[PDB]
Structures are given as C-alpha cells and as structure tokens.
Design a protein around this ligand. Structure first.
Ligand SMILES: Nc1ncnc2c1ncn2[C@@H]1O[C@H](COP(=O)(O)OP(=O)(O)OP(=O)(O)O)[C@@H](O)[C@H]1O
Ligand SMILES: Nc1ncnc2c1ncn2[C@@H]1O[C@H](COP(=O)(O)OP(=O)(O)OP(=O)(O)O)[C@@H](O)[C@H]1O
Ligand SMILES: [Mg+2]
Lengths: 41, 470, 317, 40, 127, 578, 193
C-alpha cells in the first residue's frame, strides 16, 4: 500500500506541474498578443 | 426599429460592431446577412469603441459589407403561464410540439434572484418516487437536492423517465391536513441525441404524464448558449409555478456533465484563463446559482425539488463536476455497473448511496413509523452479506457459521426482489412490506437495530413480491 | 541634503505603482510614498527606464490615488544604522525600535544586502561547539562558522530545541588546547511570520536564561505586512556580520521560519510575473536563499565568527 | 535579595542625573555644531 | 539579579535620548530665528541656487513670499518663473518642466535629513 | 465626491473614466441602480471597479460615484440578536422590504435608526479624552453596552448629553475642536483594531466538555481547528460550545454553506436558552449567514466582518467566542476572486497569498489589555472541510501551521455511539504546558500528572489492539485484560458526555479531577490485587465500578461528598474482595 | 582546433575501486555524476582531483559554496602530487564563482575553464576537468531567458539548453595537437536534479 500511495502522489504532482506550466505559457503568449494588438496598435 | 451596421471583425463565434453604445450588456440581438437569413447572438462585452457579440450558430454566410445587427431583448426574459403544462420547448422557449405559442401572464428574467435565508423553512414531507431503493433507504424530501451519479453506459435516462412518470405526493399519510396540492414535473434535457429525444417523447406520451409536465429539450447539435440557458428556463418555470400557484414541482436535470462542458466551451470562447483541470474558475458559483434555487418557503405551500443527473467522466468521483455537486447538494444516488451487467434494473447500489435529509421527512405523522429502523437494519444486513459472498469463494460454503448462510440467502433475495423491481410501481407501504418479508428470513434477535415492539408487529412474513403485496 | 518629489504616478495595481518622469531614481533605491492623508509608507525601485520606474510597495496600497500621492527618494541603496548599543534592544524587522526606547545613534551605515566574502579571505572552521545534545555532539557535530538548519513539521518542537541549543552552547577550550577563556555567544534572533504564542515562549525563555543583554531581536509578527518579511534576515545578518567582524564577537544567528520567507518570495514573484520554478516558486529562489545563507563563516586574520541555525517546517513532511 | 534591587535602583537614578550633568556642560557647542552644518 | 543592570541600562539610555532631543530642539529653535533676523538674504539665495542646480529644467521657483524683494531679481538671474506660498516658510522649491518633479530645499528638511549623522557626531562632543 | 461614467462593461468588471482622484479599494456605486463595487486598479483617468452583484442590463455612460471610504462596518448598539449577511446587511429588514427574494441594489442600515436607547453619561465637560475610553452606558438585553470613543479620536469634551432616551444618530458628546461623537462609529474590516498590549495565554477557555477541557484544552484567546465530517455531531458540538462556554458573547459566521444547513442553524438557535439567565440564547449572539448562491465578495468579507465585530466586543471588555462554519468555503471564494483578477495560481489553484490571509485572520485572536485599561479576549474556533477528509489539502496544511489546537472529529466514533466523537489519536494541543501552572494553582497540585496517567492508560490500551483483534478479549492474561477493561472504563465514563442531559452537558474541572482520581485509585488497587492474587473476572463485579459509572449525572454541588464516598468505597472494597 | 581526434584506449584512473572497476572512464571520455543533496558529488570530484593520473586538473566551482573552494586552497598545498612528487596545488587551476556571486558569471566560468583545459591539452598534457554543478549554469540560462521574455520549453528552461550542454561536452576527447603531440581532456560533470 505505501508504494502505491507514493506512486499516486508522484503522478499527481507531475500532472499538476505540467498543467501549471501550460497555463503559464498560455498566459504569457496571450499577454504578448494583447500587447501587440493594443499598446503598439 | 434601430439596426446597426458596420461590422469590423468576424472570427469564429465572435463579431465586433461599432457605434453600438446603446446595446446593454447581456442583451440578445438578431444578425441578418445579405441572403435574408436571421441568426441569433448575445452581447458579451460593451465599450465606447465597439461591442462584442457571440453568435449562437455558425457564421458561414456573414460578410462585413451587408451584415446588420438589431436589438431584441435588453435582458433575457421568458413568458410564463399556467398553460405551459403539456407543452415542449427547445430550450429558449420556442415551442417544438407544433402547437400555437402560449399567451404569457408575465415575462420573467431567467437569471432568478437568490432566496432570502430567513424566508426558508425546514423540509418536512417526502415524495413517493415508486422505487423501493429510493423511498425506503434514501428517501427524497420535498425541498431536497438529491443528484443521481451514473456511469457512461448505464440506463440513467430510463430511471429519469420512470421517476418523472411515477412521482407523487402522499397527503393521505399525513393523517391531519389530508388534502392534496397540485403536482407537476419540469423536465430539462441538455445535449441529448436524437435517439434519447425520441425515447423521452414516446415515454411521456404513452402514459399521459405529458399533461402534468413541462419539457425543455436541447439537442447535441443545438447552439451551446442554448444549452447554458435551458436549466435557467426550467428553473424559472418551476419557481413561478411553485411560488405563485402553490404547486409541488419536481425538477429533473439530465447530463449536468454536458452543461459543464458547454460552460467550458463558452469560457474558452471569451478568452478567459481556464481554472483547475481546464474548467472555469467560477464553476462552483455557477453550479450553485442553479442548484440553490430549490427549497420550501415560509408562508407558502408550494415547493421545488431537484434531481440533477450527471455521468462521471472516468467513474472518478474526484473529478471536479461530481466533487462540486457533492459540495452543493445533500447526498447522491449511485448506480452500479456490476448490478446492471447482472441484469438487475434499476441498478441502484444502496451501499454507496445516501440522503442527508432523510431523517427529517420520515417517521410518525410523515410516513409509517418504523421507516428509519427498517432502513438501518436493511443496510447493515446487506453490507454484512456482501462480504460473506466473497469469503465463501475461498473458504467454501460448508465452512460457514449457520447465520452466515442466512446472510448469504438474505443478500441474494434482497438483490432479486428489492432492487430488481423492473418497471412496476410500488407504494411506500408495499416496499416496507417487502422489506419486512426479506428481514423475516433472518433469525429474530439478530435485528439489533429495531425495537422489539416493531418486530412483534411486523415480523414473520413470506415473500410478498410474488404475491404482489396485496 | 534636499528632497525631490515625484508626482507623476501613472498606474497602481496590486503591490506595484509606476512613476512616469522619474529618470533620476537609481535601480534598487528606497523611496517614501506619501498619500493625501499624510501617511508615509516605504517602497523600493525594482525596474527603471526612460519611460517610467517600477516601485514595489512594502505594504498594502490602500488609500493611494493618482491625484495627490507623491514619491520621494530616500537613499540610492538600502542601508541600516548599526552600533554596539544594539545589544539588548528590540526591533520590528524594518529597523525601527518597538521596546519604547529612543532610536540608537548609528556608528556606521551599511548596505543590507552585504557583499560576497572573498574565498581567499575565508579560513576553514575548526572549533568544536558542545551543544549538550549527544545526537548532535557525537554524530552531527556543529562547528563555529557552520550553517546548520533544523527540519521540522507542524507539531514538532523545533523552537524548544533551538532555545535549548542557544542556552547550552559552549566551546570547551581545554580539549582543543586553546586554553583561553572566551565570552558566551551573542544571539541575533530574527522572526518572520511568528505567532504570539511562540514569540511569548521565546521571550520568556530568554528572560529566564538572562541572555537579553547579549541579544538583538528583529520581530516580524504574522499580522505584519508580507513584503517586509524579505528584509528581516538581511538586516539581522548585516548586524551579525558587523558585530562579528568589527568587534570580535562570536555570533549565533537563529532564523525563525524560512518557510514564511519563501512564501513571501513566491507572493512577490507571482505579482512580478516571473518564470515559475518547480512548484510555483520563483526560478531564482536558489540564488536568493544563497545570498542569505552564505553570509556565515569565519575570516582569516580575525577572531569573530558567524553561525546560523535556520528553522524551517517541511510542508506535509 | 530585594536590598540589592534597591541598591541597583539607587545606582540607576544616580546615573540618570550623572549623564545629564555631564551633557549639560557642552550642549550649546553641539547646537552650534549642528547649526553650522544644517545651514548652507 | 541582572534586573538591576537592565534598569541602569534603560535609565542611562532614556537620559541620553532626552539629552539628544533637547539638543535638536535648541538647534531647530535657533534655526527658526533666521527669517526674523537680517540673515535670510544670503541663506535663502543659496538654497534657491542649490534647488535650481539640482533640477536643471526648472520652470518656476516657489519660495517664501517674504523673500520676494530678493526673488524678483534672483529669478530673472536664471530666467525662471516665481510663485509664493506662505505655508512654505523657510524654504525654496523649484518645479520641473512639466511640473511632475519638484525639489524642496527648506531648512527643516535639511535638519531632519542630516539629523542621523549629526546625532552620531554630537555624541563625540557631549561624551 | 469623485464622479465618472462607464466606458466598458465586461462581466462583473466595469471600467470607468473621468475618475481621477479615486483611491484604491474604495467603495463605488455603479449605474443608477447604485450597485456597490470595489476599486482594484488605477491608471491615468481610469479606474477598475469590481461590481459585487450581477451587471445585466447596464449600459455605457451610466454614472459612477465613489464614496471615498473602504469596506467597513458600523459598530454600536443594536448588533446583538440580529442576523446579518456577509457585508452586514440585516436580513429581516430586507425580507420586510422586498419579500422572499433579495433584489439588486437594496439599501438598508446595519443599526436600526428609529429605536430609542437609554443614555447614561460618564464624562463631564472639560474632561480630556483619548481613543478607547468609555463615554457612557446603554442597556442592551441585560448587557451594559459601553459607548467607546473611536480609536483615533482625541481631544477635550465640550458638551455632554444629559441622561435620557435618544436614537443612535443623535450626537451625544461634542469635543472642543467641533468633532461630534454619537453612539456608533465606522471601522474598516481589513485593519486590526489597536490595543495596548497582547497578554500571553495563561488561563483556559473552559468549553464545558471533559474531553476538550482535559486532553486538548484551548487557552483564552487561543485558536483551534476542527474537521467537519458528516454525521459526526459537529453542529451539536458547536452549539454546545455556544451554550456552555465561558465567553460572554458568541459570534457565528456562515460563509458559503448549503441553504438547508443555514436554515437549520437559523431555526435551531432561536429555541436555545443560555444557562446563565434562562432567557433566549440569541440575546448573546450575532449571526452572519451566507448561502452558496450569494455574491462572492460577501462570502470573502464575511469572516473579516465577523472578526471585526468580535474585536469590537472585546474592546468593550468582554470575552468573545468566534466560530467560523467552514474556512474551506471561504478559501474557495478567495480562489474564485483570485481567478477573476487573472492572477497566477500557486498550488492546486489557490492564490499564493492564502496562507498570509489565514494567518492574518487568525492573529486577531488573543487576550489583550484594551485601550480603556480593561481586559478582553477573542477565541477563534475554525472548521476545515477538506475534499475527501484528506488533511494534505493546502488549506488544512496552512491552518495547522498557525493554530494551537486541533480537534479531530471522527465519523467512526459517532457510528459507534461514542459522543463527542473526537479521536484521542491525531488530536493535539499546544497549550497544555503553558496552562499547567494555572491548573496547579487553581484545580489541584496533582492535575497534570493525573492527566498524564489517563493519557498513558489510553496509549497502553491502544498499544495492544492487534492481539485483541487477532484473538479476542477473553483469551488474554490478567494484566492485559485489566488494562483493556480500565481503558473501556475511561472511554465510557470520563470521555463520553451527553449534551442533552440536564447535569451531564456541563462538567467543571473539579469534577473531571475527581473522576480521574477515582479511576487511577481503582486501577492501582486492582494492580495490587493482581500482585496479591486475584482473577480479573472477580474484580469486574465489584459495585465500586457501578459507583464510578454513576459518578456522571450528579450535581456539581453534590460531587465532593459523592467523590469522598466513592474513594472510601474503592479503598475498602479491594480489601474485602480479592 | 585540433589536427585529428582519436578513439580512447587508456583508462582514467580515479583512485576509487568501484569507479575504476565496474564503471571505467577513458582518458578522452565524459562522465556525469548526478544525485540529490548530500549524496557525495563534491567529495567524489575532490577525490578525483587529489588521486588521479592526469597531468593537470582544472576545477570549476560553478555556483557552489565558498567553503568548498576555501578547503582546497587551505589543504592542497600541504599534499603531494602522485606523479611529480611536488605540491599538489602546483598542478591545479581553480575557477570559483560561488552561489552569492553574480548569476551571469556562472555561464562564463564554464567556458573559461574548458578553454584553459583545451589550451593545456594543446601543450600536450592530459587534463581532467571537474564541473561542480551544471544545474546552476542551467539556472543562470533560465534567468537570462526570463529577462529576455522568451518562451520556456520545460520547467522554464530555454529550448536551446540541450545544444549548449552538447557543445560544452563535445570539447572533450583525445586528439592529435597541431604541434604533432598527443593530449586529452576528460570532463566529469556533476548534476543536481
Ligand atoms: N455529544 C452528543 N451528545 C448527544 N447527542 C449527540 C452528540 N453528538 C451527536 N449527537 C446526536 O447526533 C445528532 C446531530 O449530529 P449528527 O451526529 O447526526 O451529525 P450532524 O451534526 O448532523 O452532521 P454534521 O457534523 O455534518 O453537521 C443529534 O440528533 C444528536 O442526538
Ligand atoms: N566517499 C566518502 N567518504 C566519506 N564521506 C563521504 C563520502 N562521500 C560523501 N561523504 C559525506 O557526505 C558529506 C558531503 O557530501 P557532498 O558534499 O559530497 O554531497 P554533495 O553531493 O556534494 O551535495 P551538494 O551538491 O548538495 O553539496 C560529508 O559529511 C561527507 O562525510
Ligand atoms: Mg557540493
């Protein structure tokens, strides 16, 4: 049981990290596009 | 008749219109192209420079030279009347039964206002759904929010139709105040297919339950915004009926998962940053604004009861949709895939199910007096027999204690007779008689959860399922 | 000197405000932000360009407006006034007294970020410290100049262990053959996001021991502004380095909760919009923590020493 | 015991006068020193 | 037992602080007499010169209305505008080209900005 | 005031123009309906206002007016016996105005402006006053409501109102500089109220339950946490805390509960009666209610409003207990608000400043010396509801790093009919060592060692459960069977408590000390009997066991004689019987 | 530049039984030693610096503790060179850029060390190069990319990290120098995951 629980915890952490990285990249690119479209005009 | 021209941008579901300061936020507009076709849309953002409109359907024929936009409604409203009973609508109030449109008594905003907590009162009476597993063990109380958790291939639609067909109140059992209030069912379907639509139409027409219900039907190919709007239309109708005409209203919402996916698509369309696991961060608040519209109110006889139905994505209860639904509602009904594959219908699994308001709607003066103790004893006995069914596979039947054979037989007969009721409709008394007949197979004195007087009143009966419980 | 006031504030949001025509602000300078009611709160320049300058406010920006607020330069680099008379005093973690006594008279003013020690100027630590705990003394021996943190959890008694170590620490010159009797350690105690219960425990234990006359306290309570939590360890280590390497003191530095410091750093980095690390923490957390931890040690040709015992709680162990 | 505490209080209230007596001999010189620097 | 030692320490610290506050009070009160005595014409001119040197793009020079007999000639020396504000006594302040940046050169500000180094220095003389 | 117009509407976010001079986090009224909002960002002549309520039907160009003040509450007579929302709006008045629904844009006053109050002056003209002092007294449901000068107000009294009947709005005391002080003032909810000094926790917060009081005590001005599993009696335990606590005033905050749960707490409370006076318990409480469908901002500000009211009543020199119904729902509201502002999530979607907010909320509790020279305290008991009963959830981890006590409710014990259903494993208190001197001085010199003996007996019972499960209790040696039976005696006679019994619902410290003394005396005499030769089953039938079992349900004034008789019976019996 | 590269056929004797027996590394080879904190990367690298058959040892303290570089300075002059018999420090070159030193210098230190190693190879010696931690160099690259407003690839690292690492590690190997002599460079890099 402890081995399975450790594996589950590790997998959950990896998935959450990948989700956070994707969200950060999406926000960065959206910010850059919005800058180009609104500040530079 | 003011009409706006000068579209400056069209891409995907959105189009930008200039010089549109007069449009109110959230208004509904009509879009007409050069070929005379009319499309719908909603204003999702208003500014001095332009207004942003989300088109309901595809934008295939649009162009920047001839398209025009005209206002329809400042805020989404629905015409309601007592004559809506027996009708069918497409999810934005448009009739689809081929009958003339209703004549409204009034027009109400579909985004209803929250109830005042000091105006609420405690639920006190139950609803007889006709299913023994629900009425006896997971009783539904007027004003409760009791969702149903189902899998992918499980027959949730059949159970929904059966409940809508068989649900009724029991003013007779109240003893005093033996008078019935009018009862009605509001049925909302979101993201259903053609086969499900035909099945529901035939099921409602064949029995005559249509004359006592209102149907809001939204198909899979319909616009997503209509999927968002459908439950609000249904709840507006339900609130109007219950709190103006003193009706007891039962509201059934099918496939809240489809609603959640529609909300996710809409959120992605407005360029909102998605929350955890891809769903919008305000999903909990949005779901609460739907679920929390049921209840009972002081000084009024009507009531609203909700039975949301949702299919878990991967049978995973930790998914955000069932998790939030559990946060908001007062229990759940769980369907079992093993019971379905074994041929037992309806495949409701009593062990993982629970109704939090059950204790307040059962007992003396509300139902038959021994309800709670019988439910507890049934749960205990079934749970004890289920694991013996596994232990026998390794130790053999001959190695059992004598009471363990009784528990095995009780579990098998319980599955065969109590849960597997088929399409028949059972009253509360008949279900309790079947429960007592099942309990009589256990030795007296093993009923640790029941008082002796109740046992002396009701013990000692053979199976009434074959007899039909006369 | 004379003050310059900048009134061209362009944009305020969260913990950041933009000053438009402030080309004269040095990068990293400390400023004073005065609003309409006269209340003054501190800030720091974190990015400056010809278009505007970016100032990070040390507390919440409630009550600021673009019409009446003004910004004034204080100094080009953050500095702290230090003196031997700091021993026995008590501070709020920003350098301001709280024990009701008048402010000290500075002997020197030093940058709080310090400067890196030249590796050829260090010497190898050699002196055994007897802490009175066998598990440490025999198996995990502590030496003057070492930085040796304590890893604990939610309910574990790390504070009691730290107090016992501070009480029982000694040098044992006879074994080493030094022979020279030495003064006891001076204790520099920095608290970050500490509660009233733990603060009272520490204060009472120090009073019972009698080490307050040898101690300097920087206390940042848990209800204090979160941004000021960054500067507390730097001020404490500036004082410790000054004492040790200009007055030959043997200093023992105790940092109450580095977890709160890291949480504050993450909160700042999220607002600044930097590249996250492994679990949302800023990517430069290693360098930031190193600039704090590396200030301990011993210096060749000098007698003083700095020893650090940071305390942190491992989240969920 | 408490007698040593009373002696220490006596010493403290003696120092509270000795310090200001020392300071009062040169105060205006410091005033002039500060004034010559604060003024341009 | 060390309670008496700490009592002595706090007593002497409070005495030293009370001495220093009196020193600064005498300094500021003596400084306040400059506009009343015939000492202003040079100190105010030097403060204005410092203010104008610190902010090269100066537009206007707001100073004491009592210095106007000198300001009306000293402003045209540099060619900048002049304004008066009674609340700014014992000080001269110059605004920027746009007015967003202002330099203030009052004597009170000079004292309260140098007071830390002056407190460090006076302890050498008093004790 | 600063007035502007709308130039852009997008969901709950409204962008105004022409609002130069507006201050951060001020309250603004948007449109002709006067929807309330908060300023969150400023740039140029533009302000970002976050509207609380729904913004359907608004149009570009409608006026926006700023009030120039942040979110705040009114503090004065008339807060007791009332039910408020998350931003201090009286729900009864709202019902009497708009029926069963809550319409957008309703304005009502927190304190009833019409009711007269009996003023009794305390100051005289020419008296110098300073923030925190008492200006006079007004009676309120048997309480002496002391009118306090606002914390920042200072001056000298010019005029005093003579004693009589006055409304809340009437200026009562006028200072020489022209400032007017009335029976109420206004204070921002996000700034802590000042005090002279925080005193260390040295006296227990007597909860009235033996398990809580003896094994996991909470000090006055302390903090505690409690899980909320269904069917575990959490509501009953909180209700008993409200009824039987040492605290003079009770504040209960609902911050996003289900509609039916809030209905239950709103209906059950008006029936309760406090034992101190026998009157309605509602005369000592303030209720703050929030359902799941209420606006997010109200849910977020509910706990701050509640703790501000608690701090006010503490400033009046009282002892206040504050219960937060579920900090998890408040954290959910905070996460939603953070997601609205497009902030970068830290861990599991929560904003990076969640721990800071929780610590800042919990640090308002404590026992302090008020600015008026009196003594008061605020004690916070916060319930935490993790998703699956998993305490690795970030909110639970953040809470456990700052609270001093943790009371693990368990559903299994409730299913076993052991009430209150609090595990002695997992639960812990950090206040025991600090409170021990008070115990030695006040209840008994031997209380801590006796409590340690109880804890060691429980631990010894828990340390041999595997063999009992494998084999069974009857097939055990005399020592092990005696130990497990003593543990059963403890569980069923000292830990258990019936909240519905007239004299068992409350238990003093002396009574618990007597129970522990009796149990230890019996155990030691039984071990001596085993040493001198006995069979355990013979010991099981001694009537002293039935005396100890019936030691509950006795009157506290009858307890000393009962305890003496029980001790004499215990001493005599083990010599008359083997 | 070099004249030609040769296949390595002689062992780089590290003085440790397990490394020299089970997992040998050749003179022109490359080796990576990753591990958690406290595992023994730095001690192993210092042991290789003290006991090895290489003529010249180049040690690059990229972003690590200052005490680790002070210990070498203090104690190496007291030791003996295994081959020449002189002081050990006479064959050692230290490049030190500690943790609290400027971040951007971590990248430069690696290149300085490897260029010095290549020069001593061109003189005809056998050189061993120890890189104390390449993870700090990667962190410096991540910081610089953050300031440049680029797009991260994995865990915030720039997409060109692997190319930089490959370019650094490819400078190793046994070669024929432009003077016709033979020399080699051995790179042992530590990683801190
Ligand atoms: N300490 C107690 N003494 C007497 N009765 C109790 C006690 N604790 C719980 N109960 C019983 O349980 C009841 C209500 O609490 P219950 O254990 O059913 O969980 P709950 O409080 O309803 O659920 P939740 O904890 O989620 O609010 C009451 O009917 C009461 O009789
Ligand atoms: N071969 C060894 N013989 C004896 N002790 C060793 C050996 N390797 C490591 N150690 C022990 O480990 C500690 C030093 O480990 P080291 O500094 O090598 O770890 P590290 O991998 O460099 O970690 P970091 O990179 O975080 O510094 C010392 O206490 C040392 O005694
Ligand atoms: Mg290392």
């Amino acid at each position: 049981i402890p081995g399975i629980r450790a594996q589950i915890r590790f997998i959950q952490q990896v998935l959450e990290q990948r989700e956070r990285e994707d969200t950060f990249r999406l926000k960065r690119i959206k910010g850059k596009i919005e800058a180009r479209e609104a500040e530079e005009e | 008749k003011k009409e706006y021209t000068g579209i400056t941008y069209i891409s995907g579901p959105l189009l930008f219109v200039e010089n549109a300061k007069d449009l109110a936020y959230g208004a509904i507009v009509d879009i007409k192209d050069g070929t005379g076709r009319v499309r719908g849309g909603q204003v999702i953002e208003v500014s001095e420079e332009y207004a942003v409109i989300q088109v309901f359907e595809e934008t295939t024929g649009l162009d920047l030279a001839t398209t025009s936009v005209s206002l329809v409604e400042d805020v989404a409203r629905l015409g309601v009347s007592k004559e809506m009973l027996g009708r069918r609508f497409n999810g934005i109030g448009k009739p689809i039964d081929g009958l003339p449109p209703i004549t409204p008594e009034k027009r109400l905003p579909i985004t209803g206002l929250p109830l005042n907590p000091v105006a609420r009162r405690k639920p006190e009476q139950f609803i007889q759904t006709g299913i023994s597993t629900i009425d006896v063990m997971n009783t539904l109380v007027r004003g409760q929010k009791l969702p149903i958790f189902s899998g992918s291939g499980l027959p949730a639609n059949e159970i929904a139709a059966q409940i809508a067909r068989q649900a009724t109140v029991r003013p007779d059992l109240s003893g005093e105040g033996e008078k019935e209030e009018p009862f009605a069912v509001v049925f909302a379907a979101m993201g259903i297919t053609q086969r499900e639509l035909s099945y529901f139409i035939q099921e409602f027409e064949r029995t005559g339950a249509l004359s006592r219900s209102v149907l809001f039907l939204n198909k899979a190919d319909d616009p997503t915004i209509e999927r968002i709007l459908t439950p609000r239309m249904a709840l507006t109708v339900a609130e109007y009926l219950a709190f103006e005409h003193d009706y007891h209203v039962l509201v059934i919402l099918t496939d809240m998962t489809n609603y959640c996916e529609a909300l996710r698509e809409i959120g992605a369309a407005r360029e909102e940053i998605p929350g955890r696991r891809g769903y919008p961060g305000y999903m909990y608040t949005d779901l609460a604004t739907i679920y929390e519209r049921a209840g009972v109110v002081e000084g009024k006889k009507g009531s609203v009861t909700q039975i949301p139905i949702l299919s878990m994505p991967d049978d995973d209860r930790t998914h955000p949709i069932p998790d939030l639904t559990g946060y908001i509602t007062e229990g759940q009904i769980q369907l079992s895939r093993e019971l379905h594959r074994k041929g037992i219908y309806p495949p409701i699994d009593p062990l993982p199910s629970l109704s939090r308001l059950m204790n307040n709607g059962v007992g003396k003066g509300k139902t038959r007096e021994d309800h709670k103790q019988v439910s507890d004893q049934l749960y205990s006995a079934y749970a004890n027999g289920v694991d013996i069914r596994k232990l026998v596979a390794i130790i053999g039947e001959d190695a059992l204690t004598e009471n363990d054979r009784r528990y095995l037989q009780f579990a098998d007969a319980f599955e065969r007779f109590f849960i597997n009721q088929g399409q028949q409709n059972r009253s509360i008394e008949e279900s309790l008689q079947i429960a007592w007949a099942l309990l009589s197979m256990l030795p007296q004195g093993e009923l640790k959860r029941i008082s002796k007087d109740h046992i002396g009143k009701y013990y000692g009966q053979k199976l009434e399922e074959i007899w039909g419980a006369p | 000197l004379l003050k310059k006031e900048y009134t061209g504030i362009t944009y305020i949001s969260g913990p950041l405000l933009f000053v438009e025509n402030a080309k004269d602000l040095a990068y990293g300078a400390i400023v004073d932000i005065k609003d309409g009611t006269g209340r003054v709160r501190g800030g720091q320049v974190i990015e400056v360009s010809e278009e505007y300058a970016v100032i990070q406010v040390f507390e919440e920006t409630t009550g600021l407006d673009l019409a009446t607020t003004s910004v004034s330069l204080v100094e080009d680099v953050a500095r702290l006034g230090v003196s031997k008379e700091m021993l026995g005093r008590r501070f709020n973690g920003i350098g301001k007294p709280i024990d009701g006594l008048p402010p000290i008279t500075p002997e020197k003013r030093l940058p709080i970020t310090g400067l890196p020690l030249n590796p050829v100027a260090r010497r190898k630590p050699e002196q055994f410290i007897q802490t009175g705990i066998s598990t440490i003394d025999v198996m995990n021996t502590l030496v003057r100049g070492q930085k040796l943190p304590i890893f604990s959890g939610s309910g574990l008694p790390a504070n009691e262990i730290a107090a016992q170590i501070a009480r029982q620490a000694t040098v044992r010159p006879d074994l080493s053959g030094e022979g020279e009797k030495e003064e006891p350690f001076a204790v520099v105690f920095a608290a970050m996001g500490i509660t009233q219960r733990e603060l009272s425990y520490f204060i009472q234990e120090f009073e019972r021991t009698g080490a307050l006359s040898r101690s300097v306290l920087f206390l940042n309570k848990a209800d204090d502004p979160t941004i000021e939590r960054i500067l507390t360890p730097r001020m404490a280590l500036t004082v410790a380095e000054y004492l040790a390497f200009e007055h030959d003191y043997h200093v023992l530095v105790i940092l109450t909760d580095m977890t709160n410091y890291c949480e504050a750093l993450r909160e700042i980095g999220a607002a600044r919009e930097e590249i996250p690390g492994r679990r949302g923490y800023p990517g430069y957390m290693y360098t930031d923590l190193a600039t704090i931890y590396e200030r301990a040690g011993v210096v060749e040709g000098k007698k003083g020493s700095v020893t650090q015992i940071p305390i942190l709680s491992m989240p969920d162990d | 015991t408490e007698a040593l505490l009373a002696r220490y209080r006596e010493r403290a209230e003696a120092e509270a006068k000795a310090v200001r007596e020392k300071a009062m001999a040169r105060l205006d010189e410091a005033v002039a020193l500060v004034l010559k620097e604060v003024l341009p | 037992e060390s309670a008496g030692e700490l009592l002595v320490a706090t007593a002497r610290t409070q005495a030293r602080g009370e001495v220093l506050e009196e020193v600064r009070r005498r300094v500021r009160e003596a400084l306040e007499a400059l506009p009343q005595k015939p000492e202003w014409p040079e100190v105010v001119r030097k403060l204005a010169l410092e203010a104008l040197e610190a902010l090269p793009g100066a537009k206007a020079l707001v100073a004491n209305p009592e210095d106007l007999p000198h300001l009306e000639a000293l402003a045209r020396e540099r060619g900048v505008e002049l304004q008066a504000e009674p609340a700014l006594r014992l000080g001269v302040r110059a605004v920027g080209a746009e007015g967003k940046t202002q330099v203030e050169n009052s004597l009170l500000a000079r004292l309260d900005r140098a007071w830390d180094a002056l407190s460090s220095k006076v302890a050498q003389a008093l004790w | 005031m600063i007035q502007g117009v709308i130039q852009k509407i997008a969901g709950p976010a409204v962008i105004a123009k022409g609002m130069l001079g507006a201050r951060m986090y001020d309250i603004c009224k948007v449109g002709e309906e006067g929807l309330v909002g908060e300023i969150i960002r400023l740039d140029g002549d533009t302000a970002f206002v976050q509207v609380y309520e729904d913004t359907s039907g608004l149009k570009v160009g409608e006026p926006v007016v700023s009030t120039g003040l942040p979110l705040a509450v009114e503090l004065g007579p008339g807060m007791l016996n009332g039910i408020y929302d998350g931003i201090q709006r009286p729900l009864e008045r709202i019902r009497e105005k708009t029926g069963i629904y809550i319409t957008r844009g309703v304005v009502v006053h927190a304190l009833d402006r019409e009711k007269k109050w009996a003023w009794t002056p305390m100051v005289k003209p020419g008296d110098e006053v300073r923030g925190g002092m008492v200006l006079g007294t007004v009676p309120e449901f048997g309480f002496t409501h002391k009118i306090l000068v606002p914390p920042d107000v200072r001056g000298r009294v010019k005029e005093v109102k003579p004693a009589g009947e006055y409304t809340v709005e009437e200026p009562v005391v006028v200072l020489e500089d022209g400032t007017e002080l009335k029976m109420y003032h206004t204070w921002p909810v996000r700034r802590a109220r000042p005090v002279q000094r925080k005193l260390d926790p040295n006296t227990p917060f007597l909860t009235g339950m033996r398990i809580l009081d003896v094994l996991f005590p909470v000090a006055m001005g302390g903090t505690a946490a409690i899980p909320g599993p269904f069917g575990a009696g959490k509501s009953v335990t909180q209700q008993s805390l409200a009824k039987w606590s040492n605290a003079d005033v009770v504040v209960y905050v609902g911050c996003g509960e289900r509609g039916n749960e809030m209905t239950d707490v709103l209906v059950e409370f008006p029936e309760l009666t406090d034992p101190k006076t026998g009157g309605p318990l509602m005369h000592r409480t303030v209720l703050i209610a929030n359902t799941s469908n209420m606006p997010v901002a109200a849910r977020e500000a509910s706990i701050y409003v509640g703790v501000t009211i608690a701090e006010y009543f503490r400033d009046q020199g009282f002892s206040v207990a504050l219960m937060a119904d579920s900090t998890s729902r408040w954290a959910e509201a905070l996460r939603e608000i953070s997601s609205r502002l497009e902030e970068m999530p830290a861990e599991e979607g929560y904003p990076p400043y969640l721990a800071a907010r929780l610590a800042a909320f919990y640090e308002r509790a404590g026992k302090v010396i008020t600015l008026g020279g009196e003594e008061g305290a605020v004690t916070i008991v916060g319930a935490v509801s993790p998703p699956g009963g998993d305490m690795s959830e970030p909110v639970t981890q953040s809470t456990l790093r700052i609270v001093g006590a943790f009371w693990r409710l368990d559903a299994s014990l409730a299913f076993r009919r052991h009430f209150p259903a609090i595990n002695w494993n997992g639960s812990y208190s950090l206040f025991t060592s600090a409170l021990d001197p008070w115990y030695r001085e006040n209840v008994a010199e031997d209380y801590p060692e006796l409590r340690d003996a109880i804890s060691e007996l429980l631990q010894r019972e828990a340390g041999l459960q595997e063999i009992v499960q494998l084999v069974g209790p009857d097939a055990l040696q005399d020592a092990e069977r005696l130990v497990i039976e003593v543990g059963r005696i403890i569980r069923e006679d000292f830990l258990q408590q019936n909240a519905y019994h007239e004299v068992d619902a409350y238990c003093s410290m002396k009574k618990a000390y007597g129970i522990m003394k009796m149990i230890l005396a019996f155990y030691k005499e039984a071990e001596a009997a085993i040493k001198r030769g006995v069979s355990i089953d013979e010991i099981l039938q001694l009537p002293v066991l039935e005396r100890i079992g019936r030691a509950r349900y006795v009157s506290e004034e009858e307890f000393p004689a009962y305890f003496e008789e029980a001790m004499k019976e215990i001493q005599g019996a083990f010599k008359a019987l083997a």
